[PDB]
Design a protein around this ligand. Structure first.
Ligand code: ZN
Length: 433
C-alpha cells in the first residue's frame, strides 16, 4: 500500500451520487466560459475551488464538439474512440465515484496533500482590468452556477475535472486564454480543466529496453490511474501559478534512436512534470532563464498589487484580495504595506511546484510500478473499473493487501489480474518505423 500520513479529513466530504438532487450550491447545473452556447450541465463541487463535470468535453473547444472518430483525418495509432462512452447516468455515477476515489488516494499521501493544498491556494490572479490601478477578476476563471431561484451567479474556481473529448485517451490539462495575456506563463494562473477518465488506463512494459522500444511489448502492466491524475494535477499546479513552460520549448530527443528517427520533440513542460532523470534533459542554462523569467513575472504581480487602488465586480475588499495574492505568491510586506518578492521564497515556491511535485515522486509515495521515463512508447489501453473496493482501494490501488495481488505489483499485472482489465487496443506495431 501507499506511504500513509496518518488520520486526516477526507478531501471529498460527501459521497456524491450522480442522481443526487441539484441544490444550487455543490450539486448544480452550470455553464463554462465561452458557453457558446451550451446547455447547462450537471456538475459537482467536490472540494473548495474544485468541480467535477461527468460529461465528455464538447464544451472547452468549439472545434471539438463531435465525439465520432474525426471524419476529417485518419485515426492515429495512439488514440481510442467510443462516442457512447460516458453518455449514461450509470457511467456518470461511476465516473464521479472513480474521480472521487483517486483524489482521496492522492490526498492520502503527504505529497498529494501538499500538491492539492497548493492547487486550492492557487487562485488565478485578478488581472482582468484595463485600468492598471483597479483589481478585476478575469471571468474565464469563473463558472456560472444556476441557483435555487433559477438565476445564475458567477463563481471563481481553480480546477475542473471533465470527461475526455473525442479521443478518449487524450488526457490533458487545458484552460481558457486571453487575447493579451499568457495566463499560464505570466504568473497569473487560470482555471484549469483536466480532461481525464478513471475508466481506462494504459499498459507499459516492466523492462526499460522494451518499454522504450516502439516495436516491443503488449503492455503487461497497467498504469495506476492515481498516477495519471496526479501527472495532470502537476500540470495544473504549474498553470495555476502561471509558471508553465511554453509547449513550443522542446527537447529534441537525442537519447533514443527511435524518437530520433521520427524526429520526435518533447516539451520541457513534460520532462519537468515527470521529474526523475527526465528533468535533467532541461539544461541548467535554459532552466535558469525560465526561473529568472518567472521571478520577473512575480515582481510584476507584486507591482500591480501595489498600484491597486480600487477593486471592481465584487463585494470583497481591496485589502482582502491583496492579501489573498500576497499569500498565494508568498510575497513580503513592508512596514509601509508595499509588496515585494523574496528571492529565497520565490525559489522555494518555484521548486516545490516543479521539482517536488513530479510523477516520479508520486510513484515513490504510491509504491506502484510505473513507466521509468516519459520517453517511452505506449503499449495498449485497457478498460477498468476502480469503483468496487474488491477491484481497487484508496490505500492499495489494484495491489490489494491480503490477497495474491498484494505482492510484486500483481494487481497491476494485467495477466495475473486479468479480470480487472479489458484490452481495447494495442498500440505496438502501429508507430511509423
Ligand atoms: Zn503531461
Amino acid at each position: 500500500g501507499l506511504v500513509p500520513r496518518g488520520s486526516h479529513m477526507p478531501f471529498v466530504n460527501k459521497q456524491f451520487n450522480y442522481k443526487d438532487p441539484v441544490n444550487g450550491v455543490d450539486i448544480a447545473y452550470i455553464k463554462i466560459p465561452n458557453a457558446g452556447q451550451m446547455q447547462p450541465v450537471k456538475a459537482f463541487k467536490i472540494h473548495n475551488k474544485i468541480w467535477v463535470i461527468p460529461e465528455r468535453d464538447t464544451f472547452t473547444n468549439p472545434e471539438e464538439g463531435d465525439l465520432n472518430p474525426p471524419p476529417e483525418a485518419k485515426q492515429v495509432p495512439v488514440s481510442y474512440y467510443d462516442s457512447t462512452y460516458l453518455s449514461t447516468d450509470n457511467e456518470k455515477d461511476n465516473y464521479l465515484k472513480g474521480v472521487t476515489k483517486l483524489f482521496e488516494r492522492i490526498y492520502s499521501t503527504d505529497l498529494g496533500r501538499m500538491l492539492l493544498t497548493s492547487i486550492v491556494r492557487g487562485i488565478p490572479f485578478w488581472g482582468g482590468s484595463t485600468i492598471d490601478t483597479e483589481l478585476k477578476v478575469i471571468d474565464t476563471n469563473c463558472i456560472n452556477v444556476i441557483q435555487p431561484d433559477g438565476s445564475y451567479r458567477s463563481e471563481e474556481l481553480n480546477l475542473v475535472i471533465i470527461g475526455p473529448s473525442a479521443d478518449i485517451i487524450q488526457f490533458e490539462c487545458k484552460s481558457f486564454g486571453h487575447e493579451v495575456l499568457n495566463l499560464t506563463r505570466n504568473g497569473y494562473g487560470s482555471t484549469q480543466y483536466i480532461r481525464f477518465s478513471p475508466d481506462f488506463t494504459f499498459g507499459f512494459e516492466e523492462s526499460l529496453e522494451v518499454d522504450t522500444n516502439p516495436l516491443l511489448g503488449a503492455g503487461k502492466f497497467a498504469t495506476d490511474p492515481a498516477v495519471t491524475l496526479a501527472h495532470e494535477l502537476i500540470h495544473a499546479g504549474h498553470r495555476l501559478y502561471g509558471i508553465a513552460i511554453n509547449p513550443n520549448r522542446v527537447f529534441k530527443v537525442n537519447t533514443n534512436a527511435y524518437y530520433e528517427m521520427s524526429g520526435l520533440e518533447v516539451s520541457f513542460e513534460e520532462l519537468r512534470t515527470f521529474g526523475g532523470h527526465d528533468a535533467k534533459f532541461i539544461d541548467s542554462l535554459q532552466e535558469n532563464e525560465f526561473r529568472l523569467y518567472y521571478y520577473n513575472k512575480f515582481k510584476d504581480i507584486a507591482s500591480t498589487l501595489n498600484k491597486a487602488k480600487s477593486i471592481v465586480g465584487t463585494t470583497a475588499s481591496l485589502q482582502y484580495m491583496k492579501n489573498v495574492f500576497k499569500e498565494k505568491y508568498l510575497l513580503s510586506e513592508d512596514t509601509s504595506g508595499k509588496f515585494s518578492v523574496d528571492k529565497l521564497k520565490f525559489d522555494k515556491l518555484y521548486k516545490m511546484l516543479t521539482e517536488i511535485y513530479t510523477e516520479d515522486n508520486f510513484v515513490k509515495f504510491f509504491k506502484v510500478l510505473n513507466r521509468k521515463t516519459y520517453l517511452n512508447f505506449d503499449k495498449a489501453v485497457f478498460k477498468i473499473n476502480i469503483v468496487p473496493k474488491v477491484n481497487y482501494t484508496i490505500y492499495d490501488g489494484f495491489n490489494l493487501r491480503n490477497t495474491n495481488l498484494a505482492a510484486n505489483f500483481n494487481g497491476q499485472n494485467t495477466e495475473i489480474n486479468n479480470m480487472n482489465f479489458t484490452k481495447l487496443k494495442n498500440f505496438t506495431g502501429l508507430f511509423e518505423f
